[PDB]
Design a protein around this nucleic acid. Structure first.
Length: 436
DNA sequence: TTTTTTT
């Protein structure tokens, strides 16, 4: 039950021995219906992975980290302390040895070291060190147009620059050894539901600032954040925190504070949520960790239902289920540079223990990537600052009428990294071979 | 600056 476009991609991927494929498109329904058909074709022979918990959920798969048991830190190139193959008699080894196809959804969000670690882990475990991905056929799916992968400052950023030249999946060295066949999906739900919105988005993908004129005329409405059912997006945390604080204080009900515990060196600017987190019953929240039991994910929206000492209950918007949340621990890692070898080494220097909850009447655009929302209002504040940030903000909703802006978007806020545009122009051909 | 993934 695929469209003509989807069937062409389906056949191009399944009826060839070629082992490396990229199916790209502004992908929601349509990518997803194709993914499920690929999963049905392959059923036993394919493992589906994704870089984030919410993408893994939508892909009916698991996170890359949870499948390969990678640590939550920089994965140094083919490094035996970071990339460890499974034991001699483990179920993971059996699954990797018997794997025929790896489906990787939302590939645009996969940082280069993660893709390279998948390559090495598959090669080592399968004892096929001369073949990309150990001979596994890889099907990459997703839009090439996203926020850039997270790259912390300091020696980690320098390592990524020195080793790969940048953080994007197409900067992995594995592509120097295998050609990536490219299959485009052009159709989209938005082209049927809001042709104008889709046309504007296409021009903004192409970096045309003139499309901002029509977007601003259609969507600038400063009071749009005061309307019911409207999630507010901000570029920066300070303004989202202020909005969330105002809503929390107006909400009737008794507050309860959750106090984080910090050990060692952990600067407040790195805290993954508030150290003094005040909640009320009915508060709109977002969960900040993936449940190992798969009942909730980082990015799940919900409402507070129960508030108790070191434990709360959240009613999820996604499925209406109740989940019980308790504190999690995040680690602060610093890399020290050796200065006689290349040799940077990670060191955990602090920990932060807190319930994995953040208020969510307002979210950053960065936090909202990967969420599909009903109605959004972009409070621009001091302005958009990152590659793809405007595009991600606009595409959280289905129709242009579901969006409003606090002020006109300026041309300085339409940002695409040039090295990403270069890659895009090169995958127009239908096959791509990385140099060197 | 600026924000965010991953256990």
């Amino acid at each position: 039950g695929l469209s003509s476009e989807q069937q062409r991609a389906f056949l191009a991927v399944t009826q060839t021995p070629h082992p490396a494929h990229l199916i790209t498109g502004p992908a929601g329904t349509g990518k997803t219906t194709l993914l499920y058909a690929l999963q049905e074709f392959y059923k036993g022979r394919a493992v589906t992975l994704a870089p984030t918990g919410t993408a893994a959920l939508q892909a009916r798969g698991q996170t890359v980290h949870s499948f390969f048991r990678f640590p939550a830190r920089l994965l140094r190139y083919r490094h035996p302390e970071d990339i460890r193959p499974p034991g001699p008699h483990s179920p993971l080894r059996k699954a990797i040895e018997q794997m025929e196809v790896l489906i990787l959804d939302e590939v645009g969000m996969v940082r280069v070291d993660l893709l390279e670690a998948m390559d090495w882990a598959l090669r080592k475990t399968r004892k096929r060190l001369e073949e990309p991905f150990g001979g596994v056929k890889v099907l990459l799916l997703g839009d090439t147009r996203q926020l850039e992968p997270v790259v912390p400052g300091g020696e980690e950023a320098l390592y990524i620059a020195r080793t790969w030249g940048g953080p994007f999946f197409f900067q992995a060295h594995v592509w120097e050894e295998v050609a990536l066949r490219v299959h485009r999906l052009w159709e989209s739900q938005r082209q049927r539901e809001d042709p104008l919105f889709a046309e504007l988005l296409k021009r903004l993908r192409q970096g045309d600032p003139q499309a901002l004129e029509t977007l601003n005329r259609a969507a600038v409405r400063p009071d749009g954040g005061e309307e019911p059912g409207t999630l507010i997006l901000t570029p920066r945390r300070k303004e989202a925190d202020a909005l969330n604080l105002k809503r929390l204080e107006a909400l009737p009900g008794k507050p309860l504070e959750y106090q984080a515990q910090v050990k060692g060196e952990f600067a407040e600017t790195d805290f993954p949520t508030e150290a003094a987190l005040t909640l009320k019953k009915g508060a709109q929240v977002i969960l900040l960790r993936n449940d190992p039991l798969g009942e909730y994910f980082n990015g799940d929206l919900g409402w507070v239902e129960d508030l108790e000492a070191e434990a709360l209950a959240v009613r999820l918007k996604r499925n209406g289920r109740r989940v019980v949340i308790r504190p999690f621990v995040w680690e602060k890692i610093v890399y020290t540079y050796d200065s006689e070898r290349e040799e940077i080494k990670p060191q955990v220097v602090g920990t932060f223990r807190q319930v994995p909850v953040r208020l969510a009447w307002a979210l950053t655009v960065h936090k909202a990537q990967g969420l599909t929302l009903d109605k959004v209002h972009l409070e621009l504040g001091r302005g958009l600052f990152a590659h793809g940030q405007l595009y991600v903000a606009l595409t959280r909703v289905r129709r242009l009428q579901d969006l409003s802006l606090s002020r006109p978007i300026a041309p300085t806020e339409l940002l695409w990294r040039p090295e990403v545009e270069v890659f895009e122009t090169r995958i127009q051909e239908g096959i791509w071979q990385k140099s060197h």
